[PDB]
Design a protein around this motif. Sequence first.
Motif, PDB file in Angstrom:
ATOM      1  N   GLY B  61       0.855  -1.309  -0.006  1.00  0.00           N
ATOM      2  CA  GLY B  61       0.044  -0.129   0.023  1.00  0.00           C
ATOM      3  C   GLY B  61       0.895   1.477  -0.134  1.00  0.00           C
ATOM      4  N   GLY B 339      -3.331  -1.795 -11.969  1.00  0.00           N
ATOM      5  CA  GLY B 339      -4.531  -1.983 -10.927  1.00  0.00           C
ATOM      6  C   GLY B 339      -5.520  -3.023 -11.646  1.00  0.00           C
ATOM      7  N   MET B 342      -8.458  -4.198  -9.700  1.00  0.00           N
ATOM      8  CA  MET B 342      -9.794  -3.308  -9.419  1.00  0.00           C
ATOM      9  C   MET B 342     -11.049  -3.898  -9.945  1.00  0.00           C
ATOM     10  N   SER B 419     -18.391   3.496  -2.947  1.00  0.00           N
ATOM     11  CA  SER B 419     -17.010   3.702  -2.858  1.00  0.00           C
ATOM     12  C   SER B 419     -16.682   4.858  -1.757  1.00  0.00           C
ATOM     13  N   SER B 421     -13.044   6.510  -0.047  1.00  0.00           N
ATOM     14  CA  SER B 421     -11.563   6.787   0.040  1.00  0.00           C
ATOM     15  C   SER B 421     -11.012   6.151   1.160  1.00  0.00           C
ATOM     16  N   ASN B 423      -7.162   3.208   3.118  1.00  0.00           N
ATOM     17  CA  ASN B 423      -5.993   2.839   2.944  1.00  0.00           C
ATOM     18  C   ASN B 423      -5.344   4.160   2.915  1.00  0.00           C
ATOM     19  N   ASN B 426      -4.895   6.127  -0.140  1.00  0.00           N
ATOM     20  CA  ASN B 426      -4.217   5.516  -1.328  1.00  0.00           C
ATOM     21  C   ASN B 426      -5.250   4.887  -2.361  1.00  0.00           C
ATOM     22  N   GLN B 427      -6.175   4.018  -1.739  1.00  0.00           N
ATOM     23  CA  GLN B 427      -7.187   3.442  -2.405  1.00  0.00           C
ATOM     24  C   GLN B 427      -8.239   4.454  -2.272  1.00  0.00           C
ATOM     25  N   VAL B 430     -12.495   2.302  -4.620  1.00  0.00           N
ATOM     26  CA  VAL B 430     -12.804   1.056  -4.621  1.00  0.00           C
ATOM     27  C   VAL B 430     -13.871   0.588  -5.298  1.00  0.00           C
TER      28      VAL B 430
END
Lengths: 514, 514, 513
Positions: B61, B339, B342, B419, B421, B423, B426-427, B430
Amino acid sequence: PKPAVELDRHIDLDQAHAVASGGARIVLAPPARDRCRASEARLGAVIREARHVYGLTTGFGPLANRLISGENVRTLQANLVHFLASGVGPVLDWTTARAMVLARLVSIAQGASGASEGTIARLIDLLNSELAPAVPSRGTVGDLTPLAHMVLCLQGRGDFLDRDGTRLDGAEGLRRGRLQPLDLSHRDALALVNGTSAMTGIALVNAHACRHLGNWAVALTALLAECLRGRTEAWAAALSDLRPHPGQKDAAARLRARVDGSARVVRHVIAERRLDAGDIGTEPEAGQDAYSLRCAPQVLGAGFDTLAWHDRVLTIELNAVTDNPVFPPDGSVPALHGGNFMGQHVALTSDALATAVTVLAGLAERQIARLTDERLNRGLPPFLHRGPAGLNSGFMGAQVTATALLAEMRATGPASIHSISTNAANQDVVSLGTIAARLCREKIDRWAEILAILALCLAQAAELRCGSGLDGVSPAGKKLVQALREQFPPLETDRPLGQEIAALATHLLQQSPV
Amino acid sequence: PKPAVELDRHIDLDQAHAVASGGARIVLAPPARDRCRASEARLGAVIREARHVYGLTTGFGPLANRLISGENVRTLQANLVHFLASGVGPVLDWTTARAMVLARLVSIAQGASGASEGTIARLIDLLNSELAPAVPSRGTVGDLTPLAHMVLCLQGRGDFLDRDGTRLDGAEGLRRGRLQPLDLSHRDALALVNGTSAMTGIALVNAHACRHLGNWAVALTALLAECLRGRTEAWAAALSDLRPHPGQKDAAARLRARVDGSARVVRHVIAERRLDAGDIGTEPEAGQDAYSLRCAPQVLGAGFDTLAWHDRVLTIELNAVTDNPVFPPDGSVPALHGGNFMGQHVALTSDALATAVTVLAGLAERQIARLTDERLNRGLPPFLHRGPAGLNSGFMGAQVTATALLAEMRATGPASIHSISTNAANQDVVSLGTIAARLCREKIDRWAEILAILALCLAQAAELRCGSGLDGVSPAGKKLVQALREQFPPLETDRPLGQEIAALATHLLQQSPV
Amino acid sequence: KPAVELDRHIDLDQAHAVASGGARIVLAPPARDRCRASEARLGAVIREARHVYGLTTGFGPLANRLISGENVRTLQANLVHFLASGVGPVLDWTTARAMVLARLVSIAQGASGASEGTIARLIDLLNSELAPAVPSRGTVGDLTPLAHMVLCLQGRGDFLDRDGTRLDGAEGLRRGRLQPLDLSHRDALALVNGTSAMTGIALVNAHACRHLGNWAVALTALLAECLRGRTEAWAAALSDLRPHPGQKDAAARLRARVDGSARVVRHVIAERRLDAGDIGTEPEAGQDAYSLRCAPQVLGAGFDTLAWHDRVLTIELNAVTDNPVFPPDGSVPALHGGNFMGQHVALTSDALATAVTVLAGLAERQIARLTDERLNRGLPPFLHRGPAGLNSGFMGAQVTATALLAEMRATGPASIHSISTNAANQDVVSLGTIAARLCREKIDRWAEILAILALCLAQAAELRCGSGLDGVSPAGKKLVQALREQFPPLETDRPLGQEIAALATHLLQQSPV
Ligand SMILES: O=C(O)/C=C/c1ccc(O)cc1
Ligand SMILES: O=C(O)/C=C/c1ccc(O)cc1
């Protein structure tokens, strides 16, 4: 020994949950016993007089235009329990199924249902035993189906559940719990299969769980402040007074108490500082915290007021007679026919509470996201790991899991808006209150898991920030972390956290941090 | 002689389910084995050359900026499996968990994952055994968490499940399945903890179930026409040709085939009739059926087209490499970082199918509502009861249960739109594909229960309309009713139907009416 | 024109009266005194250079950038500027004015530091026939819409006349006899603060719901008169057995609506003693379908939700949702917190939205039953007049009511969609404004569904009881006669779209009395 709840007319939510969870035994007060004997006599007279009454001389639902001869009432009521037993899905948990039984009992205790002494005694015995009927959770549009299944169980024709959820067959249940097979010879079947007992039972369990989770939400927000040098002035009573919502004033007061004695939070009121030309520039941190701390009283407060409303409505429902038909105690008429079984009240309050729970779970989720972010946690290790960074990721997996749990909660909305005309259009509008209460329950469970993750993160953050001795941490904060550490070890190196999260969540739902 | 599926590059949804359900063994084709051996070597070269690669020389991550020395890689990947194991909730069912294992294997078989022969053998052994890893269903935002749990199980550090869902501890699982403990010494852990395996596995099982439920939806719609004198002209091929949607053309053709040989349906085209002066007036019935019959091709067709899209996307996903990083078989570069993990494709198709399932479940529910309504079922007993009316209510309870099941389905919407935000940002986006796949599954289970109710009703309605001999009923219709009657007796008198509904539902999910 | 004197507290009715232009507004002397005291306190805070958000700091995460006194005018001017990123249809006249009022009520408590001139501008706007033109979207819950309000009040934004026609800034000040807003006292945060937008929308929602609720009761009652409904299900005795306030009230109002009616069935079925000869299948069941029998319970749950919504809103409307705030007691120079977080209005608006959808569903099913020849006990299919087949009556309107309801159901709670924003500073948001707006849309749809039901009932009453409405209750008669003054019977099929819309507009502002 064991506390005893004496049921007369009114029972509060805590007593109700005490009985449902087996923490207290239950007894019918003499006045109630008499009112019920009097109602039992009215039912008998209604039957003897061949009065036109739903379920005694008529078919059910739209088939009510089919009158039934007195000689076939035993069969009629036996078939009622039969055709209604079409439920499916996982059985209601031990406490909840028992809460449903209690809800039906309370309604009967008002003395307008005609239930016989034997019938009432069977319910009381169940509640005083260590058993619960095994009833499917789905089937009702809001609660004849789950109640019909309960009847079958009480007759030994259905399974029972012990405190662990392990099922026992009917015969074994009656045996183990010393329960006598339910006998409906008095033609009082409608006293058991009626009302909003299921949704009310599910809702009272929801009420109790939320109280505990609400306490953790407060306690954890306070500990978060101790881990991030949170500013206590945003929690001042003066602010509550300017926007006097009861829930907010309460949340703020409880937060202030949690951090009392702490040397880790910032207690200075920024407006006391007088600035001079030399102060004009860019400071390291802003004068106020991010919303997950600063607006905690307002967010938690709104949730608390929603719960307060839910409970006010539920208290009325629990102590009401949601039966149809009903037999007026005053004897003004032989019976009354209406729709007090329409659970729109519990349906709407459950949906509202569900939304509040989702909102509060979001707050906890964002609190985890802030605390574990090295760019926002003010000096704490990324994801609160210990050991070498990179090799160790700490709570990095648990943090994403909290988000996944919240995202799932959001996918389900209110149940109440999905009424569909059914029963040959006779039930052209339905409450779906039982589904509403069950959906809220699921969110409550997800919320407990998110809070559990936050608690484990905070226990770690407190030690990383203040050392293993928790120097500067408030007395309440210290007790909470110490209690957690009794069962949950520090995360010195990466390890699977799934089982611990599940274990702690179960605890949060039943006890508060004190 | 248990069939065998030879995996090279491509595998269709039917073969996938055959293996996942244990109906077929799986073997790796020679060219696949070679591509994997070559990839394994490429992973060795990448490590040997100390290439900057995620998970081999970096943290995970946002922590990937912390580079890791070769001597600490074993520990790095060991902690990866550890910190990721934060999953909670009921475990995936036997077939679905195995489908997940299969999905990871197919990805690896493309030869770009670097998995060692032993690692591949462990997956193959699991699939050829009667076991499945016991992995929590919640925790991923879309599928490292459930896959990390899989790794633990395969190392004997996690539970296993037998075909009945009974749990075995790590040791017992390895023993009973005659499995070797997973060894990740080659540093190929990222070949197992990667991609969209969980959501893909859940989705492929949804795909198989929907094919069967779709066949039942067609079969029961056809049988419904035979019970209500339905008009077949609305199902004419000419109408399909005028509005060429593949799913509709197929639905209409399948409906016509089901009623072939029926003397209970009306086949006359109303427009053929020429009216005179004495015809003007009010006829007993309209020249067209209600939509639940007349629009079945269009409603079922749209659902089928949705499933076809879902299956096209899923087929690509199942046979793709969703790993990160990846090692190009052509040797162009040491590795690629992106990615492909995903899961937005499975997330969107699962949500679309969930909507389609809820719509089709609605059709079935309305078909039940019409069939049981004495005012709409053209002469059939109210709620298809037998015995004296009123005393018996027949399926009156089951009909409401069907409505409750549908109402609950509607309360849950798409998972993809939530979704959040995470991590440490960073993510920041999702897919929530695993959640979407699971929510679709639950709806599929409810649909099966609704179809089961409709099936039980139709068996009864057929006998009431055409006698026990089913006179005039099509060959297909007779076979279906006779097949049902082998395990489900007629409803001559009211009885609990819950257990029968559940049992039949389980059957509808795995077999079609043939 | 009546006048509402604002001191400390104002109820929802007084608030809507001012917002709707039915009443002038005046600030009571005690309020003016408290406000002057607060204005003086702000002055001292500024003179003393106290560290206060918006007076000596940047905004949001930029509050760590301290600002020198000479630059505060520019600071607050830029605040209004960067916040004016709103988009979407403007709030309607009444709602925009309700927002202005909400900010004023907060200020009147005497903890905002607003200058006399700033207060005068808000009062002037409310006493005029104009409303600021403010975009409805942009806030996560209400700086954006309030920033737009400020621009309008400075003559840099449009205004709306009662009809919704737009006027440019200069024209607005001239026509409304309004002076341009001057924020030289550095009291901008007194206007760009709190939950004014969502509160204003919600109070308009509250008023509309009271009227629609009255119609829902009146139409349920008239339905009973058209379908020989049984009144025993509405007995007070039943209410007493399950004492929810909303239910007791619904039942009582229903009984009152049918008082004097000879078209309803008042017999208590349990009074009848059955003989062996009576055993068999009778023409009709002893109880009505749920859309009539369970009306007290369904309407009642909705009324209890509205009561909760109103209790919470009354507190919010009369609170100070400002940040920062200046304590009247002088304990500290200023307090910093988050009273602007609109979670209370967010949760109550979402809860009310659900209730509205539930009650609209009841009305829709009442139409579905009344227009169904198989269920309306002898009335023409779809209540048509003229030859059947050639005429379909309300067959189209009935489907339209279903379409309206289905659309309502597609939108759920707004509160569950919080998203971390403002560089994570606002990591949790209420979305209260969105919640109130989504509830408003459902309320508008509910009004159209009720309008359809009302037109169907007027026709049904005449078909069942003749144009003279024989046997119909005094209240039922009065309701139909009133409708018939503007809506002719349906003797032959005609477009109903415009009539449905026109009636819906009426239902939102007036009750059947
Ligand atoms: O009171 C009514 O009219 C409805 C009764 C009912 C009884 C059993 C059902 O399964 C559905 C409705
Ligand atoms: O690929 C990435 O950058 C993110 C990886 C990740 C791995 C484990 C987590 O728990 C969260 C994110």
